[PDB]
Amino acid sequence: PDQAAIDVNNRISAATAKLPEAVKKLGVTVRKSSSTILEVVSVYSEDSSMNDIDIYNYVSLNILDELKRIPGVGDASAIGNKNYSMRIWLEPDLLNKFGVTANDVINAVNDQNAQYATGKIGEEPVVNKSPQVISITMQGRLQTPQEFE
Amino acid sequence: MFSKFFIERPIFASVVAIIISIAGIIGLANLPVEQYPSLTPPTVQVSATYTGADAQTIASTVATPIEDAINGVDNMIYMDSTSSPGQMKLTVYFNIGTDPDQAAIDVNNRISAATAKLPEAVKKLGVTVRKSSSTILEVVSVYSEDSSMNDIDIYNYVSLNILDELKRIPGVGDASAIGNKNYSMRIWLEPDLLNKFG
Amino acid sequence: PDQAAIDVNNRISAATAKLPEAVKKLGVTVRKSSSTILEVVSVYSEDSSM
Amino acid sequence: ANAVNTAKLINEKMQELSKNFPQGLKYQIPYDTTIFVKASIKEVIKTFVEALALVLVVMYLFLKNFKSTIIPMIAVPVSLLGTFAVLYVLGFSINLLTLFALVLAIGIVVDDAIIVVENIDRILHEDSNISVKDAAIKAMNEVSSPVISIVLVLCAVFIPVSFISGFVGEIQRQFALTLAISVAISGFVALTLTPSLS
Amino acid sequence: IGFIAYLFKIVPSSLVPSEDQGVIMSIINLPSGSSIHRTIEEVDTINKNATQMKEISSSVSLIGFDLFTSSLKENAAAVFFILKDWSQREASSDQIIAQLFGQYAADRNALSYFLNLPPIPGLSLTGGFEMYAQNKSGKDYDAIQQDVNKMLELARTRKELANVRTTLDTSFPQYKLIIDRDKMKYYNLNMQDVFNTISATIGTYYVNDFPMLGKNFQVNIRALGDFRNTQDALKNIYIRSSDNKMIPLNSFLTLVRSAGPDDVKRFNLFPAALIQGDPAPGYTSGQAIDAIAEVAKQSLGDEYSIAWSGSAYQEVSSKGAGAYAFVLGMIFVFLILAAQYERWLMPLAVITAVPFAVFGSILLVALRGFDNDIYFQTGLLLLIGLSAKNAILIIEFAMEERLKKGKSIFEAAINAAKLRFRPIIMTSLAFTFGVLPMIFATGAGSASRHSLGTGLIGGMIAASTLAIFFVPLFFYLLENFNEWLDK
Amino acid sequence: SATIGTYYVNDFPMLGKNFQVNIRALGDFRNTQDALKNIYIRSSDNKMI
Amino acid sequence: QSLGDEYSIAWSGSAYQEVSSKGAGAYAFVLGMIFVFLILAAQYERWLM
């Protein structure tokens, strides 16, 4: 199966360039998985306090990463697909009222929620030698919903 | 008796000794010579360069996706990553007894899928996957006794001329220089002139 | 023939930095090859309609 | 590959390149792991020669016959060359661990040769009527089963060391498997060739 | 056997003895955030001082690269002093290291640690075990370092945990870029454009590649070095608005001084800090591992879970199957000897003849002061083999005397020992004088040769001197017991 | 795709890992066949179409 | 003769195989004769037969 996976990957690498931008952005995963369920492990909250999203994100962050390192586990996933995401719920009547479109919001989020590269201050080659080399640090990615608002 | 058969037949014992000697001489001539065998568990190094990015930015944006993709590769015990300003260095440790080439090709195949997520600059410079199980045979230092050649000149002379000849030598796995100063067309902006000309 | 492709793939990926950008964008293909021409099959139309 | 040959080729090629070097540019080799393996090879050769000389001295002292000294001079190199052939077949490489193991294996080989020849001589000198061939046959009938049992016991001691995993497991596996090969070859030689030469 | 156990208890154990490799690896670390011209000057002074040293033939310097953490730090440098050949120089590497520490012990700008080159590749620099404390809870690295400092405070007290250190360093100076997004958009600007100007003036911008000498080389854009060495660098940089107005960068961007990590390390998809500690001289390395594990458990929070790498991983992993392997190896030895002798009790004579070699080897290594290295274990394997060889031969001859010749048990034991005395002494003399030079070995690979040779010689002397007397005693006892059961 | 579907713009930092940012219209505005009526797009003449 | 020291010659396919395999037949012949002699000395227990 290892040689089979390697052959499939070698042949796939050429076609992945042809794929649409979104498809390759999400990635194309090749696994030696039998696609038949070996076993199902159900993680549940007896208190019922934790909602479905919180339980899914917990098992995704902690349990799944450990389980994938188990030898003999081709793929271990949870059915919910409820990973956290900063959902922005557009209101088309308000979009029309203020005059913006969905593309404007797309561009604004793509522009104002990315981290970029900023060099260091006082790096060589400089004629006036400075005592220290100081790195510039920026936080361009918003963290809270009150920040995306 | 077994020993009596050879005692009564000195020529048979002698030719057995001669054949053993010939096989031993052949093996001795063909025995690989090293300092130490592969005692250390095999490792695979993943490197990506995000020039001008801080350590935290690299850790969150380059280190996390590649590490997540590499997680799950077969025969992997533990995986470690160090993010420094400009560069991300990832070392995957595999269970001892794993073929280094199988591990390297596995990590390569995973990173092939993970690459498109990475920032544009990281993709443009590329992600480098190699096996670090090989040990150093030796170190050769090319130096300028006079001040005629700078670090740049020596490094580029070494990379263009010295390295190619050394890699052709039989038994040389690879030769790599450490200076990391390739030729580059440097454009040095002067903000006073930039503002003067608008 | 299988292990040779693995080793070539590994060395090519190890020397990623040296490649230019255009070949990286299009991609580099490593595939087992063969110089042996087993046969040549000719498909032709008899009516000459195609 | 051979580290020593490769290092020699690298040095020769570096001199050749240094012939066509820009003015002021030199080269040097600060670190070279071939030094350790060459020194280890020289030390192992010295140990082998010293052990052979001491075996000849003790044999010429205790047995009082110079013609008897020829037996170890043939038994020991044959055992060592057989060990080398088996090492090459199994895939081992000449490294520091295997050379250190060979230093030990010298002891096993000389012990077997001395044991067999001394037993032959004791039986020869116990009875005046007995002939050299009869004495050899009697002594080998005495110690043929013990030699096989010793070989099996030594192997049952050394093989389980190999199954140990980890860094120490591999390092000790080198010694253990070299010793097991050495005892097997030495026992076979002591069963077949040594009594014939005696 | 009790004294053997005591000697094994009072002999410290090490993985591989430190050796003189002919190279002294020197690690120079300036205060964090230092420029590289300072590192270059410090390395130049270090090299010029080492030129006075007679042993140090030449120096190889890697300025700007840190060897402790594989990363480019301008404040760091590694200098290797290439020593003369072992024959030429009288002083060993340890004496030169002591001299270097002595001349650089006084407080100065740079902290230089002079250590010997590792004996076997794949072993960490110095002897510090590798431990990673993953932070599941996602705390900031400044809090992670505070917790690690608490853990190091608790570990520093214990004598077992010598020289505990953490690579996690958050004291590097940094400039925090505070984007005024309201002002940024009020100026008709896109964040990507302003950060492209920052990346092209203060950082390097790799636009594309150009052909030179038949190879593609990068084209990098960066402002002149005199215009990016101060906190006010943002003053001269201008960005075009969408309204075609030149706008200075300091209008909406601010540089605020701060301190933070330079190397951000993540272990198994979680942030981590490396803990580097050395065992105590008396305690073993495994005991130090257990001690640091307990220290981390009691000091660190529930989020911090200790993960191990390298030497610690080998220590945890290797010892498990060795016990079962050795049990199987002894069982097989017993079965083979029983099959040879045709008696269940008799192999006990060989098995109890084994420990004399161990006794002698451990006694000689304890007296000389050599530790319980792995080479000692290999020597133990050889000594066990040879002691079992001699015991098997003696027991077989005793059995043959008792059965074939009909000698009494006492007489059979006497005659067997007398017969086997000569070959045992012959081989003992030959092998002992053969391995005698190993104790007085030359410089190249000296320590391993010394350890193996001293263990081997001790075991050989003990076996040839003592086991010859004791194997007949065991044969006599076991044969009398066998006669007892026959009655 | 931004209104009726989910548009994956980029990632944002939460709990140490990276999590997606998705843009979609409210459930009531992508719920009928007439969903296209409420959604507008600006042309190149700055007219909401 | 023509190209000179600036050029070296290299082979491919059958030419390469022949140039590299020059001498293998003689090596096999010598080893075969040696082993035949050794085996016949073993069986007949004489050196000159």
Residue numbers in the entry:
A (entry chain B): 100 to 248
B (entry chain C): 1 to 198
C (entry chain A): 100 to 149
D (entry chain C): 298 to 495
E (entry chain C): 546 to 1032
F (entry chain B): 744 to 792
G (entry chain A): 843 to 891
The article reads:
We reconstituted purified RE-CmeB into lipidic nanodiscs and collected single-particle images of this pump using cryo-electron microscopy (cryo-EM). The extensive classification of the single-particle images indicated that two distinct populations of RE-CmeB coexisted in this nanodisc sample. One of these structures depicted that the trimeric RE-CmeB pump does not contain any bound ligands. Interestingly, the cryo-EM structure of RE-CmeB depicts that this multidrug efflux pump forms an asymmetric trimer in which the three protomers display distinct conformational states. Similar to the structures of asymmetric AcrB, MtrDCR103 (30, 31), AdeB, and AdeJ, the three RE-CmeB protomers in our cryo-EM structure present the “access”, “binding”, and “extrusion” conformations, respectively. The entrance of the periplasmic cleft of RE-CmeB is encompassed by the amino acids Y658, L660, R710, and D823. A flexible F-loop (663PPIPGLSL670) is observed to connect the periplasmic entrance and the proximal multidrug-binding sites of RE-CmeB. A similar hydrophobic patch is found in RE-CmeB, and this RE-CmeB hydrophobic patch is composed of I178, L607, and F610. The superimposition of the apo-RE-CmeB and RE-CmeB-Amp structures shows that these two trimers are similar, with an overall root-mean-square-deviation (RMSD) of 0.6 Å.
